[PDB]
Ligand binder design. Sequence first.
Ligand SMILES: CC(C)c1cccc(C(C)C)c1O
Ligand SMILES: CC(C)c1cccc(C(C)C)c1O
Ligand SMILES: CC(C)c1cccc(C(C)C)c1O
Ligand SMILES: CC(C)c1cccc(C(C)C)c1O
Ligand SMILES: CC(C)c1cccc(C(C)C)c1O
Ligand SMILES: [Cl-]
Ligand SMILES: [Cl-]
Ligand SMILES: [Cl-]
Ligand SMILES: [Cl-]
Ligand SMILES: [Cl-]
Ligand code: NA
Ligand code: NA
Ligand code: NA
Ligand code: NA
Ligand code: NA
Ligand code: NA
Ligand code: NA
Lengths: 311, 311, 311, 311, 311
Amino acid sequence: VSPPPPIADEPLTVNTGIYLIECYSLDDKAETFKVNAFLSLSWKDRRLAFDPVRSGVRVKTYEPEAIWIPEIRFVNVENARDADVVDISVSPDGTVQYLERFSARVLSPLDFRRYPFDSQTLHIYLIVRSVDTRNIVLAVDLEKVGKNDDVFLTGWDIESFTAVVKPANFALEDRLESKLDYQLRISRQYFSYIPNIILPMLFILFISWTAFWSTSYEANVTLVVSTLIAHIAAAILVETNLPKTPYMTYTGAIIFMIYLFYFVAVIEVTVQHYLKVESQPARAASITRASRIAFPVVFLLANIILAFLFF
Amino acid sequence: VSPPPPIADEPLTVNTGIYLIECYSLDDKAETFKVNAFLSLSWKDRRLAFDPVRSGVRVKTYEPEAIWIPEIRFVNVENARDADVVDISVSPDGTVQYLERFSARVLSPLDFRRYPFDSQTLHIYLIVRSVDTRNIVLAVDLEKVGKNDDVFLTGWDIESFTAVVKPANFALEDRLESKLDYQLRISRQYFSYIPNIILPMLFILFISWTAFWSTSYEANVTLVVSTLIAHIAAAILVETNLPKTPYMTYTGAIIFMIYLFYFVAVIEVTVQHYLKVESQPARAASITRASRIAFPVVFLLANIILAFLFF
Amino acid sequence: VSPPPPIADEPLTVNTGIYLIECYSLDDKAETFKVNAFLSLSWKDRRLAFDPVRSGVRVKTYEPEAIWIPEIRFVNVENARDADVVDISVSPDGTVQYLERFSARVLSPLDFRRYPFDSQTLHIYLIVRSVDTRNIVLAVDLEKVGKNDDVFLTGWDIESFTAVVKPANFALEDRLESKLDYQLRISRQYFSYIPNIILPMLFILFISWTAFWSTSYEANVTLVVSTLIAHIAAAILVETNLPKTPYMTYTGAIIFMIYLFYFVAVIEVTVQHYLKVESQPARAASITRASRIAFPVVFLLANIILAFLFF
Amino acid sequence: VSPPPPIADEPLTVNTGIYLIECYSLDDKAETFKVNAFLSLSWKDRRLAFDPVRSGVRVKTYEPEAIWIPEIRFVNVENARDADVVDISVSPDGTVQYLERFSARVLSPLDFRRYPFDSQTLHIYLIVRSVDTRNIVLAVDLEKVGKNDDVFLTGWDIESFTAVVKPANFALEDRLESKLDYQLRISRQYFSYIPNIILPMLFILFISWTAFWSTSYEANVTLVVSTLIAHIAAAILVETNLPKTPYMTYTGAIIFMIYLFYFVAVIEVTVQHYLKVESQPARAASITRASRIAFPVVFLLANIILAFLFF
Amino acid sequence: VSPPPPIADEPLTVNTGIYLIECYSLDDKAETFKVNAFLSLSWKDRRLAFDPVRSGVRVKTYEPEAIWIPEIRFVNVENARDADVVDISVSPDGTVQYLERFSARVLSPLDFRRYPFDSQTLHIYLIVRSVDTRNIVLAVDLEKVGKNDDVFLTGWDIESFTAVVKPANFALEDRLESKLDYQLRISRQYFSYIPNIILPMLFILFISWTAFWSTSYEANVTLVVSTLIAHIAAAILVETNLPKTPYMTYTGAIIFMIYLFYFVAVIEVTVQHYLKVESQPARAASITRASRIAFPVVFLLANIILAFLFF
Ligand SMILES: CC(C)c1cccc(C(C)C)c1O
Ligand SMILES: CC(C)c1cccc(C(C)C)c1O
Ligand SMILES: CC(C)c1cccc(C(C)C)c1O
Ligand SMILES: CC(C)c1cccc(C(C)C)c1O
Ligand SMILES: CC(C)c1cccc(C(C)C)c1O
Ligand SMILES: [Cl-]
Ligand SMILES: [Cl-]
Ligand SMILES: [Cl-]
Ligand SMILES: [Cl-]
Ligand SMILES: [Cl-]
Ligand code: NA
Ligand code: NA
Ligand code: NA
Ligand code: NA
Ligand code: NA
Ligand code: NA
Ligand code: NA
């Protein structure tokens, strides 16, 4: 079966629509998500047109094998989608109405710059390659773009699922290729990050600053070193659930900054002890007393600067 | 093939049933479970009618390809079910009795609010989409809904497997959809959490409170810090076997609360030492003596408050 | 093709056999194992009978598609087996001899009560569903049940592979089902657990008891706490390679008991120090001296009691 | 269908091209990467030639089954490529223009010698085996070799995707094989390694060197031992994300060198204490004072030597 | 299609050959490896013989479906191989020359006794089952057994790939089976284990022995305990990348031995302190002085004994 011939020299408009049934497995490291949805396609094939009076039927149903069907592919998929044709309906004028249900692992990159307070725009790119006979062009039927209310992405809030109505038409290997951009806007559920990593990470840091109320070098060493080991554990746990970014992230910045605070506390603890042994604890006292205000004030201001730069 | 034609204007009732053979792999992080079960379907196709006098047989057998079979799909599956048609039997009136055995990764969300003392209601949604010729409607044959006695879901107790007999009939992309809700009620076996996670977590917390019977700042720092690190390990181990919830969980609350208890013990240990050095151990003694009763009493009451809020 | 018709009203006996080629991947958490084996089936279809003098041939070979073959399934498999028909041979009387080679992920539960000194009975359940024409019943041909000598299950000793000759015949969805139980008896190779997990766990416990020969509260705190953190690592390592059991296991008991020993040592270390500070080291000495005998004696007796209860 | 016959006994030149759609999953340990791309093939089959004036058509489209298609196979793939024929076009002369879209897990080794400041050359090898009728030879059509702008490999910069135009023709099992080398040049984005692994690893090393300003053996033991445990965690974290190389890597060197610095600091801390106890702290002072300059200077020079050897 | 009939009563000799293309993923815990290779088969079928004069052709090419092809299987594979027939050529005398390219997960056990200085012999077993018509026997065509030069097994050196020319002919389920043994000899690249696991493990042990030059019980406890924890981390990192063996391994022995050295050092540290407190440091001094020579000497001799027993 060949593509429907043009009346004049017009391209064949294939109207598309994606209706999300299930959205799942959003992998941050892999920058992938899984989607189970309906794909609807509609085009006019005049060869399939009929008289409802003569045929007695208002709609004719066909098996895929029986008629010409446009080769639609997804651009950003790991492997080609698992599809099951649900229905093919031909109206009397020849307007084919194709519907299939598919599942695909979509590969769409994420911007971790504001993590875990980030929002994302996931993309699903539909594509058709023109044939020799005639050029195929994609269109969006907004009445057939959606998601069911129950669609739930674990750990994310689904804001919108819309399509960019104007396709990106371009040459690829001397043939036209009509590309459509379906956008799924999601925003991260940061609630858990607060009681789970943020607050515990801050408490173990504040526990380290109790060394500013102690003269016991042995206890201070223990305090600042032990908490630094706890911070290493947090920093490992955080970074292992994120991909290696060529840009600095908000969480990355915070984690790095905290390492400097530990390093500078070790230096303070060291200086204080050196002076006490040198029989000059008056200098050590003034240094320690300053640190009690300095460390929190600088930490607080540095965070204000950081949050400001990132948001 | 086309769907069986209506005698009058009635929809085609497809009677369904699911009989669970093996229900396994319930993944808490993924909020998915695997199921291997029988799917039974029964509908009338008068076209298939026969005389057993002429045909010789009292029941006719068919290959799926040979007759019209309703396109039944699962709503909440990762990928389309792996099915194997077990049997297709047509009685003289044209009543079809279809049976297949399938396997599926069902994606049904869990409520972790009372974890590990939570119960769940897993869902398996059956759906049929109406055709142009006639409307298809799902029904439940309760004689064909069940589970074998041996069905075991590791670390869960299977309470019931029932179906919500009245289907959810609704429009979707200008066609009728008949949706059935199969409910598998399970409850978590929390036994292991007690000797494994709970009691060890409580002993290492009580071990830290022995610092209320010591004056050695160096030993107290060691005690409270070391046990804090043990609790960091605990919390990570617990937290990595749960998904990131936008709501606070019972275990999450307990774990968070325990972090405050360590932070407040570090403060007590710090205050006690400061006073000892300040040559006023009478204040330090009274503060420490209070802490011995305070810490357990407050911990016990806080837990009573927490358990109350969550159950 | 319909099933072979009965001479009288007898059921069709399908003789079965499983000959294990490879046994691998016994996952303890998942309570699954992978199997690669031959499945042999034999039944009499008189329609296929021939004269060996007239046909010249002793045996006729058929393609599966050509003749009626009973739909045999495995009950306890994750997904349906990957089979390849090796041979179909028909004798003059009409005795069909079918042979296929298959692979499957069997889901058979384990009893962790005596782990790592446990033995298991893995099950492979064969099942046939009766048809409307006639009832199919399974049988065991013991001459076709076995395993090759080289079958090796890593970290397990294969004792026997036998079949329970009497099938479990029962009604399921108003049709007869004939179920056969194939039992693979294995016993765990516990050797490695001794130099790997057991002895190191016991040494780090005995290391903590050296605090009974020390008066240094700071050194005892260090000793008992450090060894406790090592035990936490041991316990996590052990329990992450086991599923969550609703029953107490031998290893689980030992691990929990050891936790108590650390808690009670912390108490001893605390009491000894309190008394030393209270200027009464005579009581502290007698308490410590007792602990030196008490701790090992109690540990040894508690283990005798435990081993007795579990074996 | 047999291969096209030669006019004069020349080999059949199959012109090839690979246009990368998506690059993903570069696994360093596995030395594998995944690709989704277009594969274009073009050859002359005179049997397929037609008249364009008489036939009215300038191009004829065929189903793969209809014509002879050269068996093109990737050398370095885990399993054979998933492919979907996009189009087959025949020009009047009989020039076939085949296009398929495929996915493959390519196995191309990496050189970890300069990690994480390394660049790589990934390979995709195309191969054709000659037939008895005639020899098939591969060629590169540079106008059909490329990648889309959006191709992104997470944590890697894509430099170029080119082909080595001259095929490696050789005998294999008494038949000619024509092999083509497609090269994808990538370079690691090392940015993240600096705030994440490098700077933290250097700070915990510098923290250990504060023991050169302390006389407290107990505090020095704590300092050097604790920071050493931190380095063990770092080194384990780094080494588990790399394969076992028979050559020394840049990071491997750095990590190993750092272990010696900790061993030599333990020795210094030990010597200093021995002398202090031996009532000769003048020697201990001079040894410690030297170490303060020695340790950083030697560390800095050793790194200059190392970086020089590796780059 | 039936098997070729015998001229006399001779068995049908199927000549085989395996030429390795890519050898990857050798999993130590699983005792498996992946292989991608050519499988060549050749047998005489006189029914296929032809006159090269009357046919004009010197070789006839067939589709698998067209002719009889022996059912060749691999014994030790997880699931049946993924094959693609490359070519089927019939010479005038009727000699079929079949060639396919396949991929398989071969399950061949490893001997970890000398790990990481071990060598292995991986096996690939080819098998054919005899039919009632005639008994099929495998043979090795040494000209068709090999590997390409580029075959690389990450972290292993490929020594040889040979076949044991004499097949193991035996009865299995009342039919003969002809089994061939293909042996791939590999040896582990132990280089990395030295800077990575061995030297760091030895240095953290030597760091513990500095407690023989200290009188500070608190510092010795810290030293011997901290290092013991580092050895636990090592011992896990090692053992988790190895399967549970019923035999003692070289690395297992070394690791176990080192645990005794830590236990005995804790005992020494304990005894030394007890005596110091007992106001008899002359005994403590002589015990400590002995330990300084004893510990390394015994460690060195124990290793010589161990290496001797294992190599
Ligand atoms: C589960 C949660 C509270 C948690 C446990 C342990 C450690 C950390 C980091 C913050 C150090 C953490 O996120
Ligand atoms: C997760 C479970 C197996 C576990 C093991 C050992 C100790 C703990 C405490 C410290 C939380 C624990 O939670
Ligand atoms: C490899 C082996 C000796 C090992 C190392 C570290 C800890 C454990 C036990 C204590 C769980 C262990 O099994
Ligand atoms: C360097 C090494 C010790 C390390 C520990 C913990 C966390 C990180 C990053 C996230 C800072 C890290 O790379
Ligand atoms: C002691 C040994 C098992 C070990 C510990 C930490 C780091 C490494 C390498 C990466 C140096 C290592 O293999
Ligand atoms: Cl697609
Ligand atoms: Cl489906
Ligand atoms: Cl099955
Ligand atoms: Cl391929
Ligand atoms: Cl096979
Ligand atoms: Na079509
Ligand atoms: Na059908
Ligand atoms: Na300490
Ligand atoms: Na059949
Ligand atoms: Na073809
Ligand atoms: Na084809
Ligand atoms: Na064949």
